[PDB]
Amino acid sequence: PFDDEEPPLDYADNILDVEPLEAIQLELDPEEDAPVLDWFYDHQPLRDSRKYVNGS
Amino acid sequence: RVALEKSVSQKVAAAMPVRAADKLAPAQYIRYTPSQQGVAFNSGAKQR
Amino acid sequence: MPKVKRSRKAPPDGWELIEPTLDELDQKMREAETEPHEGKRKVESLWPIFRIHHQKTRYIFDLFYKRKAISRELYEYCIKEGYADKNLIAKWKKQGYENLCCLRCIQTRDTNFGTNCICRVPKSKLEVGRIIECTHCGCRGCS
Amino acid sequence: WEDADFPILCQTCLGENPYIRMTKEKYGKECKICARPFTVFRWCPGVRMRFKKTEVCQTCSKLKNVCQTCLLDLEYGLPIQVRDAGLSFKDDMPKSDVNKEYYTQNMEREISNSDGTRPVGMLGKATSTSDMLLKLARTTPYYKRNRPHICSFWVKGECKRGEECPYRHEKPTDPDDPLADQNIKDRYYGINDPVA
Amino acid sequence: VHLDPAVKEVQYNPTYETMFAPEFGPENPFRTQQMAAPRNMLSGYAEPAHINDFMFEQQRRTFATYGYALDPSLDNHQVSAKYIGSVEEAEKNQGLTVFETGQKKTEKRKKFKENDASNIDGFLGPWAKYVDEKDVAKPSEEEQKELDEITAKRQKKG
Amino acid sequence: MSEEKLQEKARKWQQLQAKRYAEKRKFGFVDAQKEDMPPEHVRKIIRDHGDMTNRKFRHDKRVYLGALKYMPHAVLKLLENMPMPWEQ
Amino acid sequence: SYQKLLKYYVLNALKHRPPKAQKKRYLFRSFKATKFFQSTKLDWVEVGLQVCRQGY
Ligand SMILES: [Zn+2]
Ligand SMILES: [Zn+2]
Ligand SMILES: [Zn+2]
Numbered sequence: 001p002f003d004d005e006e007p008p009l010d011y012a013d014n015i016l017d018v019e020p021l022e023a024i025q026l027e028l029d030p031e032e033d034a035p036v037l038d039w040f041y042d043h044q045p046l047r048d049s050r051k052y053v054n055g056s
Numbered sequence: 057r058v059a060l061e062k063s064v065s066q067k068v069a070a071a072m073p074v075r076a077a078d079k080l081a082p083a084q085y086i087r088y089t090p091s092q093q094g095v096a097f098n099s100g101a102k103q104r
Numbered sequence: 105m106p107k108v109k110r111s112r113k114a115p116p117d118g119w120e121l122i123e124p125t126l127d128e129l130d131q132k133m134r135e136a137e138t139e140p141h142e143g144k145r146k147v148e149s150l151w152p153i154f155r156i157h158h159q160k161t162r163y164i165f166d167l168f169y170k171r172k173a174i175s176r177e178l179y180e181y182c183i184k185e186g187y188a189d190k191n192l193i194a195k196w197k198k199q200g201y202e203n204l205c206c207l208r209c210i211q212t213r214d215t216n217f218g219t220n221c222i223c224r225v226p227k228s229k230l231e232v233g234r235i236i237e238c239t240h241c242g243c244r245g246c247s
Numbered sequence: 248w249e250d251a252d253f254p255i256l257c258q259t260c261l262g263e264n265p266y267i268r269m270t271k272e273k274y275g276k277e278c279k280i281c282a283r284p285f286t287v288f289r290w291c292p293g294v295r296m297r298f299k300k301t302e303v304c305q306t307c308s309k310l311k312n313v314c315q316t317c318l319l320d321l322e323y324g325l326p327i328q329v330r331d332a333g334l335s336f337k338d339d340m341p342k343s344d345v346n347k348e349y350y351t352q353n354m355e356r357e358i359s360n361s362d363g364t365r366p367v368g369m370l371g372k373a374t375s376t377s378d379m380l381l382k383l384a385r386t387t388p389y390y391k392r393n394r395p396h397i398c399s400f401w402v403k404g405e406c407k408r409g410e411e412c413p414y415r416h417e418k419p420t421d422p423d424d425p426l427a428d429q430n431i432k433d434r435y436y437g438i439n440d441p442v443a
Numbered sequence: 444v445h446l447d448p449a450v451k452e453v454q455y456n457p458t459y460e461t462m463f464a465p466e467f468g469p470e471n472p473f474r475t476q477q478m479a480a481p482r483n484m485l486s487g488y489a490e491p492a493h494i495n496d497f498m499f500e501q502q503r504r505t506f507a508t509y510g511y512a513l514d515p516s517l518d519n520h521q522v523s524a525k526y527i528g529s530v531e532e533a534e535k536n537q538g539l540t541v542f543e544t545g546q547k548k549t550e551k552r553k554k555f556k557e558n559d560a561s562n563i564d565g566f567l568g569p570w571a572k573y574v575d576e577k578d579v580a581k582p583s584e585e586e587q588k589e590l591d592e593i594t595a596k597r598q599k600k601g
Numbered sequence: 602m603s604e605e606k607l608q609e610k611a612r613k614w615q616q617l618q619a620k621r622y623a624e625k626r627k628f629g630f631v632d633a634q635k636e637d638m639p640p641e642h643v644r645k646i647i648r649d650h651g652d653m654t655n656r657k658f659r660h661d662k663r664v665y666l667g668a669l670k671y672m673p674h675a676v677l678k679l680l681e682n683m684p685m686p687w688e689q
Numbered sequence: 690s691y692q693k694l695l696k697y698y699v700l701n702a703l704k705h706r707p708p709k710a711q712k713k714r715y716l717f718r719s720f721k722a723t724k725f726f727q728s729t730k731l732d733w734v735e736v737g738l739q740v741c742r743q744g745y
């Protein structure tokens with residue numbers, strides 16, 4: 001993607017301020033997929049909820 | 057066997073050098089008598 | 105211009121009245137991250153970073169426990185987004201540790217003998233007036 | 248390789264305070280003479296001073312009978328050249344590097360097979376006391392030896408870091424003085440040592 | 444009496460009288476100061492202590508702050524304890540350590556404070572400079588010239 | 602033997618024992634975790650050192666070579682944690 | 690292509706031997722116990738550039 005003589009771009013000023021584009025994620029069907037909808041696409045979905053996973 | 061297995065271990069320690077960091081905290085005290093005693097040298101004491 | 109939010113949910117109630125100073129502190133960090141190490145020692149160049157990190161964390165800390173200007177929700181929002189340091193706050197709520205620099209300056213493992221730095225020693229106990237600057241941090245005596 | 252549990256050190260190097268904290272570093276540096284790796288011990292000799300370290304291994308230290316740091320003699324604190332010349336003594340140890348290596352292994356062989364805790368091979372050649380040495384020898388410390396180095400930026404005239412500066416802000420010795428040009432090797436062998 | 448002076452690792456329990464009684468005879472003159480002292484290694488006698496960490500560290504700290512300490516040696520004379528070093532300040536300061544409320548508490552140095560973290564480029568919490576003694580020191584009008592000479596004299600050699 | 606000196610002796614003794622057998626100095630004590638530094642800290646370090654051409658950092662060249670025997674670990678742990686297509 | 694996927698599947702499960710009960714030794718814990726290492730929380734894209742810069 002970068003030509004061989006191009007030095008690797010410094011994250012601190014090329015990428016750090018750029019708003020990220022929208023991911024691939026599917027639009028769930030609201031009235032019907034409701035118990036999954038709140039948390040489905042999070043990184044480690046229910047990590048902060050003792051009722052569903054044990055902890056960090 | 058204590059003499060040889062120790063020397064064995066020093067050889068065997070070469071075989072795997074990077075499997076983990078060593079762990080080291082035997083922070084020991086030793087008491088010392090400086091031989092060349094004098095009233096001035098140790099600021100007074102016989103020992104350090 | 106302001107920092108990318110990692111949360112996507114809307115910010116809490118009192119967000120708009122803490123934004124001039126919080127975004128300006130983030131502008132202050134971006135300067136010191138880029139100033140030249142030329143006229144300064146190897147270890148001295150890292151000192152402004154520990155200082156502004158202290159200042160950001162102190163600012164949220166004062167508005168919640170002292171001035172009571174901020175709810176639980178906005179308080180924990182600023183911690184999550186990286187405006188404050190969760191760990192640094194916990195020492196400030198302890199008895200003696202209340203103007204602490206860094207985690208480094210109390211981390212006993214980061215030293216040979218396994219003790220603190222002279223940073224942490226009370227100024228009345230040194231009795232000789234040796235001006236102090238910490239190599240970890242630059243501090244002249246927290247305690 | 249030389250692995251020792253305690254450095255051979257004189258009282259002036261060791262410090263004015265009888266409670267000492269020191270760090271032991273296995274094979275941290277090469278010996279300034281024989282180039283062999285040795286265990287480096289480093290300690291703070293007092294309130295304000297250089298935070299010293301051992302410069303030569305115990306092997307080289309044994310042969311001359313000198314402190315591992317200052318290379319002044321454990322019996323008198325004089326320099327090596329003064330002590331040997333006063334007893335009309337001379338060292339047969341080779342000066343070229345390849346022959347020094349050969350000699351090094353020989354002494355290694357000797358100390359390992361003998362008791363080895365002793366100068367007595369090299370001291371035995373000249374055991375006699377001399378009125379010259381006993382008059383000159385230090386009865387008391389010389390802590391001024393220990394004082395910090397000179398600040399090079401301050402000599403340049405733009406001393407940043409201000410009054411914090413642990414290095415000394417005083418005039419260095421004039422370069423035209425023959426006493427400045429000292430060398431560890433020359434002090435160890437005892438050749439052209441100006442202090443002597 | 445019955446115990447060799449050249450002895451180690453005694454397997455039984457010797458009585459005081461059969462272990463501490465004198466070696467007989469005259470001393471030889473053929474032994475210098477280093478040779479006569481009971482050394483285990485070239486410069487002296489090294490033996491493993493187990494002194495309690497809090498007490499070592501306290502006394503060590505105490506000497507650096509003041510210049511007196513309580514003597515760590517374990518024979519000397521078994522008669523009376525003493526301080527060491529600048530013993531005059533031991534009786535003066537009533538023998539305190541660093542880990543105590545000090546006797547002297549006066550003439551503290553003055554520094555700024557702006558403990559608010561609200562004014563950008565004005566906060567200085569524990570990084571506060573003393574107000575009197577200030578940066579960018581240089582020592583003289585004329586010492587500079589003398590150091591200029593010394594550097595010039597160094598240029599003449601190479 | 603003055604009662605004044607006794608009271609000072611009591612004060613000395615009390616302080617000494619309290620810190621000697623203080624709870625944070627018990628045999629089983631393990632000091633607190635190494636908690637995280639600010640993220641800007643490592644950012645400046647990498648950007649300062651650049652490509653090790655500068656004179657100043659020349660001490661650290663030895664470490665930058667010596668670290669190479671753990672680079673396959675770093676490569677492994679990096680790709681293992683790669684973000685999934687639903688994550689920004 | 691189907692058939693050659695089965696080949697590597699069968700061989701793995703056949704030549705499987707149980708774990709030898711080797712003693713646990715955590716590499717990165719031994720590292721971070723030492724003064725030379727520190728820890729922080731960073732964007733994956735920032736770290737990826739750093740590893741490439743370091744490896745270069
Ligand atoms: Zn600090
Ligand atoms: Zn500190
Ligand atoms: Zn501090």
